[PDB]
Amino acid sequence: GAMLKDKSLGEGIKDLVIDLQKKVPMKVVHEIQDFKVPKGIEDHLFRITQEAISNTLRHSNGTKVTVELFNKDDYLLLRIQDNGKGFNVDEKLEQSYGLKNMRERALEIGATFHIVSLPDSGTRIEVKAPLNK
Ligand SMILES: Nc1ncnc2c1ncn2[C@@H]1O[C@H](COP(=O)(O)OP(=O)(O)O)[C@@H](O)[C@H]1O
Ligand SMILES: [Mg+2]
């Protein structure tokens, strides 16, 4: 896993995507809103993003994955959405270290963690992290 070090979350995501795009058959796109993410939660969100992308590339057999990062004042929203085959989260969740670790990173930063994956809907991961105005 890449590490952010000096970079903002947005910059880390964009740089990772640049590298991935050269190697992978899925189209990987980002929609990153320009706003300051609190330094304290950036690493956690980057670790979630990397796992979500990894799972999409390996497991979805889709053609496109989108990473979105939006500011909604009281919270930020991180969404990773693919158009692939989907899976049953319940069947996998408790035996799955990747999913369990994303959920734990979210908890550590006080954020919700949701996975919506249905046969015709692909897989969508959403994390809403609180922001203090
Ligand atoms: N985006 C996705 N599309 C389809 N299947 C997925 C996706 N993400 C996870 N899965 C399924 O959930 C399982 C558990 O995910 P994870 O805990 O990350 O395990 P892995 O080590 O296999 O990446 C995967 O093996 C795969 O079957
Ligand atoms: Mg995984």
UniProtKB/Swiss-Prot annotation:
<comment type="function">
    <text>Member of the two-component regulatory system PprA/PprB involved in biofilm formation by controlling the expression of many related genes including type IVb pili major subunit flp pilin, adhesin bapA or cupE fimbriae. Also modulates quorum-sensing signal production acting on both negative and positive modulators. Functions as a heme sensor histidine kinase which is autophosphorylated at a histidine residue and transfers its phosphate group to PprB.</text>
</comment>
<feature type="domain" description="Histidine kinase">
    <location>
        <begin position="4"/>
        <end position="133"/>
    </location>
</feature>
<protein>
    <recommendedName>
        <fullName>Sensor protein VraS</fullName>
    </recommendedName>
</protein>
